[PDB]
UniProtKB/Swiss-Prot annotation, chain A:
Protein name (record): Large ribosomal subunit protein bL32
Domain of life: Bacteria
Compositionally biased tracts (Basic residues): 8-19
HAMAP family reported in the protein's UniProt record: Ribosomal_bL32
UniProtKB/Swiss-Prot annotation, chain B:
Domain of life: Bacteria
Short name of one Pfam family: Ribosomal_L17
Protein name (Swiss-Prot/TrEMBL): Large ribosomal subunit protein bL17
Annotated GO CC locations: cytosolic large ribosomal subunit
Keyword field contains Ribonucleoprotein: yes
Listed GO MF terms: structural constituent of ribosome
Family: Belongs to the bacterial ribosomal protein bL17 family.
The organism of origin for this protein: Lactococcus lactis subsp. cremoris (strain MG1363)
NCBIfam families: L17
Subunit structure: Part of the 50S ribosomal subunit. Contacts protein L32.
Gene Ontology biological process terms from the UniProt entry: translation
PANTHER family referenced in this protein's UniProt entry, alphabetically: LARGE RIBOSOMAL SUBUNIT PROTEIN BL17M, RIBOSOMAL PROTEIN L17
From Swiss-Prot, chain C:
Molecular function in Gene Ontology: structural constituent of ribosome
Domain of life: Bacteria
Gene Ontology biological process terms, A to Z: translation
Record keywords, A-Z: Ribonucleoprotein, Ribosomal protein
SUPFAM superfamilies to which the protein is assigned, alphabetical: Translation proteins SH3-like domain
Organism annotation: Lactococcus lactis subsp. cremoris (strain MG1363)
Protein name: Large ribosomal subunit protein bL19
HAMAP family: Ribosomal_bL19
Function as written in the Swiss-Prot or TrEMBL entry: This protein is located at the 30S-50S ribosomal subunit interface and may play a role in the structure and function of the aminoacyl-tRNA binding site.
Phylogenetic placement of the source organism: Bacteria, Bacillati, Bacillota, Bacilli, Lactobacillales
From Swiss-Prot, chain E:
Its biological purpose: Binds to 23S rRNA. Forms part of two intersubunit bridges in the 70S ribosome.
Keywords linked to the UniProt accession: Ribonucleoprotein, Ribosomal protein, RNA-binding, rRNA-binding
Pfam families: Ribosomal_L14
GO BP annotation list: translation
Stored SMART domains: Ribosomal_L14 (SM01374)
Gene Ontology CC: cytosolic large ribosomal subunit
Protein name: Large ribosomal subunit protein uL14
Subunit composition and interactions: Part of the 50S ribosomal subunit. Forms a cluster with proteins L3 and L19. In the 70S ribosome, L14 and L19 interact and together make contacts with the 16S rRNA in bridges B5 and B8.
Molecular function (Gene Ontology), one example: large ribosomal subunit rRNA binding
Family from the record: Belongs to the universal ribosomal protein uL14 family.
HAMAP family: Ribosomal_uL14
InterPro entries membership: Ribosomal_uL14 (IPR000218), Ribosomal_uL14_bac-type (IPR005745), Ribosomal_uL14_CS (IPR019972), Ribosomal_uL14_sf (IPR036853)
Classification via SUPFAM superfamilies: Ribosomal protein L14 (SSF50193)
Length: 53, 125, 114, 205, 121
RNA sequence: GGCACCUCGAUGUCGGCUCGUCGCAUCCUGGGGCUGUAGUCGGUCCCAAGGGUUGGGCUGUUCGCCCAUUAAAGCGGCACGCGAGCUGGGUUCAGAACGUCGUGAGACAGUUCGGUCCCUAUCCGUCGCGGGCGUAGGUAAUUUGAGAGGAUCUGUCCUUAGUACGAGAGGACCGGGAUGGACUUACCGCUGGUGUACCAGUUGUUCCGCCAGGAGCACGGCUGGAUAGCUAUGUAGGGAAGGGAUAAGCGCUGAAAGCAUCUAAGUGCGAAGCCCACCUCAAGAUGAGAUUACCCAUUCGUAAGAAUUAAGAGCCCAGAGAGAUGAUCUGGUAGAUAGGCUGGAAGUGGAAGAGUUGCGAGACUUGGAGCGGACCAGUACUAAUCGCUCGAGGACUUUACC
RNA sequence: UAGCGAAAUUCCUUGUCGGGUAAGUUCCGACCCGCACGAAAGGCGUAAUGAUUUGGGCACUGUCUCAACGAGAGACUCGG
RNA sequence: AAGGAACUCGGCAAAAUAGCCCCGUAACUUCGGGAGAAGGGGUGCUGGUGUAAAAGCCAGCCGCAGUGAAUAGGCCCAAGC
């Protein structure tokens, strides 16, 4: 429960190694933008090439 | 599957029992993906019961629907839209009887800025 | 389970007559202790049948020595050959575990025949 | 010597002979698809890395159609081994009707994946007492004697469980009533839903 | 079954009560279904019969909730729970072993109890 | 017992529950000798720790006693095994009481009732699943097996044969078979149990303007069930027979010592011991294996590298045989991968309406009716579209022959 | 002295016997050897009364044989 | 399930019973009590007829279940204080 000794900060970051965030795949400039994700909706209503608000 | 919804089955049946009538009094609806998945199972088969216009079987659907006032108006005037019953089971479904099931389409809306909630739009056609 | 219904549909016997939930049934069994193939007739008020497939079928509750007894066996078992309805008993529900008490009028009365 | 390339469709019960209601089961009995022999010289063992389950175009790979390279034709999905062989052709061989290891079959499956469990749930120790004002129930027990500043290993304590292949011995069915596509086996044949049940026999027999 | 349970009578014994102690299983059974020799003792008895206050005796189990599945696969016979007293061996105590019984005792050494049993099932 | 050397800025000290492990001075199972052993049953020791070594009553408490047992009802060690796992019947608060002692204040392990057991895992260690690299190319399948684990038990009956033995009584050895008992693996078609979106009945209550038919709430209002899946008590399984080295023991021939002598060479036999053999984990087995196939050998001064990209692999999505999540598997329309649709089971039990009878309550016809979740077959009706990222061009040295 | 006595009192010791109990140091009844009972520090009785303390029995029973199932909350996956 | 307290120092907790009516009710007693002793029965609806002041009747209809759920005593024996 209660820790014994001090974490050395290098080992603390060695705990913090796998903790990182993962980039989501973003569809890039479509006309000149704007963006969606694949399997997701654009800001212009577009999923599967048709506007749905 | 037929899942737990994060709510007591009282409120699964009940929250379901609200959102179905909401999703027919409005046309297409954006709410979250899990309740969208129970739409995907449930509201398909029970508006498929909506295809048959039995007064007895739609009376069994009278549990599934509830008393409403339309905003697809003018229900209050001469007849354009019904109540929750007895005409929209053709005003919708006459388009929908040649089709062999499969009346919603589900589209993954951009997730919500509240608590990172990915929510969706379901449509009926 | 269509290959299940193929294989388990095969080799079964058809001749088992229809019957609604339980009643007193003439049973025609062949078991023998003397290894001489002796007819063992059995009787007693069936509770009902078990459901769910060709295997899972009825019991027989014979109480007729002051002890309730049961006999669960499949219909298509060739060791039994013949079973007969003595009273066409029709009651409300399927599997009368309410049959566990008040012996008299449940015993003489389950018929509701037409 | 046992081309038992196939899955089940489930678990049943049938009377077979002189009645005798037996928990009964089956294997799909798909035609065997055995590759070449691959003798002891190039690789010290004997067995066959037999192919099985007949893919469509999508599930393949240029080492899979490229396994129809060094095979002749028809890439497949699953590959096991069988030591004890007869050998007919490089890629695909003879079907169910031959049986050449034994009818107490020692059947091999890959068990049902029930997940991570409780401590008792398959490790089978005594669940703790409930009543009488004690907190302790559903927790397996102490494990470290005091004289070492250690704990030992070996004692099963927890574990994500179920995907563990088992080779149970002497499953009891006789010379099988065949088909183009059945194999009668008995009852609690291991494995899972959509699991291949390939089996060598008579290793304790 | 479980031991240390009071059971009713099915034989000319006069012992109104019969609670066994432990059936062997070598030393390691916690079941007495059918076909097996158990170790009774009595707490209540008739004005007749042998003797009443806690007497270690031997017995044969007769009625259970259900014993073993038959090699038929047809299923097991009676509902409630009873047994009879052993007459020092596989002999029965008296003539009227009253109430029914099943055939699955005769395969032990019990066929004389079966002979003094009116009907089998 | 003694010893005061750590522990007074904390070594929580009974017994029990759970969970075990080792030791052998071996309790049973194994072999063998001796016997004041005719056997049967015994005594006795030698080798043996592979496995197993009961359940209750009483005793807070060890010890011990009783019952009934089996193969036997082992002895110990381990912080009298284990309280950051647990209980708190035991001293070990304060109360109160007795007895006894003390004028008293109180006391006396003398008794008894009641009496105040926290910790949100940091490391190491455990259990299970992952990422990053490596295994002189990138891959993708296959396995060997260096090694590591698991598991080992035991009745009962018959035959051999009431023979041998033995006046008899009694009762074999060896060896065949059959059959339990646990323990443990698998799995839920069976006995079932359970089932929170399945069907029935049904109390009370509000509401669907009326009723009917329904809804909500009353633990899931209660109850009869029960599809799936899960689960034992449900179902099946094992510990077989081997090999080899043997311990103990028993051998031949033999030698000082012409004899003798299982020993000194030299040769045998010989056990649940050991090891292999039965099962599982297994090349991060850096020695990183061995095999099967594919891509190949690119563009840029490429010295350095850099950037393509093959073969792929992946993101992303769908779902579950899988699952905390990752990861696994199934798939991504060249489609049954999930949901719907259709058909059927599926359990329920004769829907509703309508009509008939009946003062009504109700009965009956339509009508195995009607309904129906995780159950199978088909069905593209939706969703797996579109897209994007990572990802080899393979170094030396020697011989063979490159 | 009366009267009670293995006492909430006897470690004397599982006192003895009998009953409950197959199994019975605890329980009851007698015995009474009273270390060390005991009379207004009341003693012996005493129905009803007790969140009493025990001992036995009936009833019901997942406490336990030997567990298993589902519902909710954390846990745990992510966002704050 | 089946079995019951075999668990434990200890049926500890949970279980189960309870409403209303109507029967019936030991022991001792300080004669009130005990005692709701215990144990038993009934309990839904339909039409009558009688119930409105008023239960009971009759028949039927039903029921797994009739204080249909909720809410509401486990009892007994004995001893000590």
């Amino acid at each position: 429960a209660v820790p014994a000794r001090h974490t050395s900060s290098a080992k603390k970051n060695r705990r913090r190694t796998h903790y990182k965030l993962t980039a989501p795949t973003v569809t890039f400039d479509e006309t000149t933008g704007d963006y969606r994700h694949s399997h997701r909706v654009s800001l212009k209503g577009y999923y599967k090439g048709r506007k749905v608000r | 599957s037929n899942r737990k919804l994060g709510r007591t089955s009282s409120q699964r049946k009940a929250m379901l029992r609200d959102l179905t009538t909401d999703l027919i009094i409005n046309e297409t609806i954006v709410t979250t993906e899990a309740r969208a998945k129970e739409v995907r199972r449930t509201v398909e088969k029970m508006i498929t019961l909506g295809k048959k216009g039995d007064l007895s079987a739609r009376r069994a659907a009278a549990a599934y629907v509830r008393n409403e006032i339309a905003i697809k108006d003018f229900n209050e005037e001469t007849e354009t839209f019904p109540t929750a019953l007895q005409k929209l089971f053709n005003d919708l479904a006459k388009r929908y009887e040649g089709r062999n099931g499969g009346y919603t389409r589900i589209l993954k809306v951009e997730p919500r800025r509240g608590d990172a909630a990915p929510m969706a739009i379901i449509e009926l056609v | 389970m269509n290959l299940i219904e193929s294989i388990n549909a095969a080799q079964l016997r058809t001749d088992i007559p229809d019957f609604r939930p339980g009643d007193t049934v003439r049973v025609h069994a062949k078991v023998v202790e003397g290894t001489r193939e002796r007819i063992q007739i059995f009787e007693g008020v069936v509770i009902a049948r078990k459901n769910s497939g060709i295997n899972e079928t009825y019991t027989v509750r014979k109480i007729s020595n002051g002890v309730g007894v049961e006999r669960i066996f499949p219909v298509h078992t060739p060791r039994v050959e013949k079973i007969e309805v003595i009273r066409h008993g029709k009651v409300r529900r399927a599997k009368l575990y309410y049959l566990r008490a008040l012996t008299g009028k449940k015993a003489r009365i389950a018929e509701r025949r037409r | 010597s046992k081309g038992i390339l196939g899955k089940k469709v489930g678990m049943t019960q049938i009377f077979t002979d002189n009645g005798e209601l037996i928990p009964v089961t089956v294997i799909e009995a798909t035609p065997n698809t055995v590759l070449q022999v691959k003798s002891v010289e190039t690789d010290g063992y004997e067995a066959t890395q037999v192919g099985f389950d007949t893919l469509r175009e999508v599930l393949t790979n240029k080492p899979a159609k490229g396994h129809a390279a060094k095979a002749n034709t028809t890439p497949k999905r699953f590959v096991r081994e069988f030591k004890g062989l007869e050998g007919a052709e490089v890629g695909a061989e003879i079907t169910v009707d031959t049986f050449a290891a034994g009818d107490v079959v020692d059947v091999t499956g890959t068990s049902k994946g029930k997940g991570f469990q409780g401590p008792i749930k398959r490790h089978g120790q005594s669940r703790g007492p409930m009543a009488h004002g004690s907190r302790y129930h559903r927790r397996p027990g102490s494990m470290g004697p005091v004289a070492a500043n250690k704990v030992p290993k070996g004692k099963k304590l927890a574990g994500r469980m179920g995907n563990k292949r088992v080779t149970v011995q002497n499953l009891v069915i006789a010379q099988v009533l065949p088909e183009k596509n059945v194999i009668l086996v008995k009852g609690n044949v291991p494995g899972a839903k959509k699991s291949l049940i390939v089996v060598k026999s008579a290793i304790k027999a | 079954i479980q031991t240390e349970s009071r059971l009713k009578v099915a034989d000319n014994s006069g012992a109104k009560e019969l609670l066994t102690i432990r059936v062997l299983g070598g030393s390691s059974r916690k079941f007495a279904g059918i076909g097996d020799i158990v170790v009774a003792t009595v707490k209540s008895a008739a004005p007749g019969g042998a003797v009443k206050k806690g007497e270690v005796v031997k017995a044969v189990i007769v009625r259970t909730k259900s014993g073993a599945k038959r090699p038929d696969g047809s299923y097991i016979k009676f509902d409630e729970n009873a047994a009879v007293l052993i007459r020092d061996d596989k002999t029965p105590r008296g003539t009227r072993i009253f109430g029914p019984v099943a055939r699955e005792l005769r395969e032990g050494g019990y066929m004389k109890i079966v002979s003094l049993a009116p009907e089998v099932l």
